[PDB]
């Protein structure tokens, strides 16, 4: 009435299936019963369609509805009440043991039916036989047994069954499956009759009860593989939810109900091979819900639910893929993963100012908001962003997508930086520069480059630091000149061991990081100019390569080395006296330079723009 219709998150996320249960038993009877139990699970072994959909639980102002009034009654409707109960003993004709088992089985099934009457589950009686098969029509004592047991508890003869050995037990377990299915379905149809005869009446326009009735009958139809009546009922329940215009800040219960039935309807669509329907539903719903909230909006609201909603819908997509629905994938494989990811980022941000407002001051219900603040503080982990982008990246790769995986990877790296775990971030950036450099998009390339330098300096990975710095040098004309100069001087500093000057930009811990390093770390665009390739019998070659500098700020002129190329035999412009080659070797000789060995100001470039052949 005033309480919530249903409060179960992730209700029956698993495929709803028929559920038959029966009384708990000791280890030795179940030890004889083993073969029967793995005969049951052979359906799990066999293909799912060959598997009977049933499952095994193995237990030990109008007036409100019965069994429907509560969400806990509802959860009971899930599993707590199997639609079939079967009492297990062995059927064994005997002399005195026969009578003893008669008396005891009669009494126990008597209590069992005393339990089962109100819950209306019918109690079918199936008994094991290890003895030789009985020819029907031969034993009149079997007839007396049937009479006595049937009159013991009112369970009819047809309900009674016999459990033979495996070669027959297989087919008879299967026909048992069929009978259990039939009587469960009869139960479910009856229970739906209950629902409908309740539905005819109304509690003077509450319609929450109506939603409960549709949702219960959704259980029923989903359960019975109808897949249709339930989804119609879900549609109608959601509609009547809508006609309930929001009274007040209690939009959250509405949104939760919406998400529940929304999952239900979408997945039921996916069961029915109606992807377009599902897509339109989920969009319609999510922007409806975006428009839903106006206030409070404690920034818990609209963020967590929306992210979870996208999450669930991508999960439904994956369910569809498991089914085999590629119509939705060929358009876009991992649609809502990274929308959910951006929503959880927004959620962390919202948490930031939620904190901030909590520092403002903190007479009714306010303590609840306080525990809310604390609980979302628990949520400040935001590794969920990482997981969501992980799934998004995988799914994007699934349809041969590189850049969305590449951009969400930059998002991963940047949140790693917010995570502080700059190491993984620099690993990502290290992988991500090459593709940007091939891509030539000169805008983005420097934009990621400055962040990559930031990661290198914080990490103290001086090798990557210098490499990305020198590639920035090669074409740094987009940025300001003095910054180029500072980069270069920091580079020389670190080649000869001096820490970089942005000391306030650095922290003592990172100081330790890169003071520690360089123990293993060892060893502007210009051109190689060879005057004479394909050497003849006698010649000489001097400094003809021309070291053009694209950077404005000059490279300091101290030294340089060129390593004599092994091709064949092992051996503002600045033109100078270096002039290595002055000797004679064998003819038909060519040359090709690995790296600059740039000892001008720096020791060496460590980045391969020392072209071999232009």
């Amino acid at each position: 009435m005033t309480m919530d219709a249903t409060a179960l998150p992730s209700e029956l996320l698993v495929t709803p299936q028929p559920l038959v249960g029966f009384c708990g038993l000791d280890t030795a009877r179940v030890s004889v019963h083993k073969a029967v139990w793995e005969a049951f699970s052979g359906s799990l072994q066999r293909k799912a369609a060959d598997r009977a959909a049933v499952q095994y639980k193995l237990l030990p102002e109008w007036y409100h509805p019965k069994g429907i009034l509560k969400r806990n009654w509802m959860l009971k409707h899930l599993h707590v009440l199997p639609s079939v109960v079967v009492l297990f003993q062995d059927m064994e004709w005997n002399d005195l043991q026969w009578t003893e088992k008669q008396v005891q089985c009669a009494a126990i099934v008597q209590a069992l039916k005393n339990t089962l009457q109100e819950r209306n589950t019918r109690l079918c009686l199936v008994l094991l036989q290890r003895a030789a098969p009985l020819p029907p029509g031969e034993d009149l004592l079997a007839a007396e047994r049937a009479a006595s047991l049937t009159n013991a508890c009112g369970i009819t003869s047809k309900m009674l069954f016999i459990l033979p050995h495996t070669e027959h037990l297989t087919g008879y377990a299967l026909r048992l499956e069929s009978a259990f299915l039939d009587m469960a379905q009869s139960y479910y149809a009856l229970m739906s009759k209950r629902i409908r005869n309740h539905r005819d009446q109304l509690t003077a326009a509450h319609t929450s009860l109506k939603i409960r009735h549709q949702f219960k009958l959704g259980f029923v139809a989903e359960m019975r593989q109808d897949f249709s009546t339930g989804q119609k009922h879900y549609f109608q329940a959601y509609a009547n939810l809508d006609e309930i215009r929001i009274n007040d800040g209690n939009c959250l219960e509405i949104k939760t109900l919406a998400g529940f039935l929304n999952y239900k309807i979408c997945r039921l669509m996916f069961k029915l091979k109606t992807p377009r329907d599902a897509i339109n539903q989920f969009i319609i719903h999510v922007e409806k819900h975006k428009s839903r909230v106006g206030f409070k909006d404690l920034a818990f609201e609209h963020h967590a639910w929306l992210s979870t909603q996208h999450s669930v819908f991508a999960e439904l997509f994956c369910e569809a893929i498991k089914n085999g629905l590629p119509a939705l994938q060929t358009q876009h494989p991992g649609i809502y993963y990274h929308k959910a990811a951006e929503f959880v980022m927004k959620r962390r941000d919202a948490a930031m100012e939620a904190y901030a407002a909590m520092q403002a001051s903190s007479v009714a219900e306010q303590q609840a908001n306080m525990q809310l603040c604390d609980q979302e503080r628990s949520y400040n982990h935001s590794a969920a962003i990482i997981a969501l982008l992980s799934q998004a990246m995988a799914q994007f790769k699934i349809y041969k997508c590189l850049r969305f995986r590449k951009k969400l990877a930059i998002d991963m790296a940047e949140e790693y930086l917010k995570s502080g775990d700059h190491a993984k971030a620099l690993t990502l950036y290290s992988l991500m520069l090459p593709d940007y450099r091939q891509e030539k998009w000169t805008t983005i390339f420097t934009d990621v480059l400055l962040k990559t330098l930031r990661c290198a300096l914080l990490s103290g990975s001086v090798a990557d630091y210098i490499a990305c710095s020198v590639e920035a040098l090669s074409l740094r004309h987009q940025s300001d000149q003095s910054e180029r100069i500072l980069i270069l001087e920091n580079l020389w500093q670190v080649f000869q061991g001096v820490p970089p000057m942005p000391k306030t930009q650095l922290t003592p811990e990172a100081q330790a990081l890169w003071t520690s390093a360089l123990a293993n770390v060892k060893s502007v665009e210009m051109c190689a100019t060879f005057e004479r390739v394909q050497l003849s019998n006698d010649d000489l070659l001097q400094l003809q390569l021309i070291v053009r500098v694209l950077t404005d700020i000059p490279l300091r002129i101290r030294s340089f080395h060129v390593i004599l190329a092994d091709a064949g035999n092992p051996q503002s412009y600045y033109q100078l006296f270096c002039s290595t080659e002055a000797q004679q070797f064998h003819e038909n000789t060519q040359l090709r330079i690995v790296r600059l060995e740039a000892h001008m100001g720096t020791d060496q470039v460590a980045a391969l723009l020392t072209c071999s052949s232009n």
């Binding site: 041969k400 997508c401 850049r403 951009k407 891509e439 030539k440 998009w441 000169t442 805008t443 983005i444």
Partner: protein
Amino acid sequence: MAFCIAVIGKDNAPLYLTTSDMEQELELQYHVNAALDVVEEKCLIGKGAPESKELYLGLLYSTENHKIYGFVTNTRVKFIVVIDSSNVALRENEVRAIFRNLHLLYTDAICNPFYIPGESLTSKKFDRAVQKLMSGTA
């Protein structure tokens, strides 16, 4: 109604200004807008982003407040404006006309002998061509 103009070469982008009808594009997605394109290629490229037809791409790529409409020529040039309007009452017909206009303006900047093809569009004239396009159809 932000038309992130972007001509693309074979792979890289010769001109991609950030202008609209009213004034400059403040939103800081530019280099990552080009990154939207590098996912419009290598992903939303399929076997399709290059074709041998004057390319109608009614929303080859879509997202919130950002809708990509594409075009490709036999010379493998990528012509893309973005519909940065969740929705405005403009229907694809004038978008087709706009890609006609953009085709013509680009190829008349191409008409320069001095400007080597595949380089940043130097022409302040082809600029004002794009600028009138934006000021008109945004």
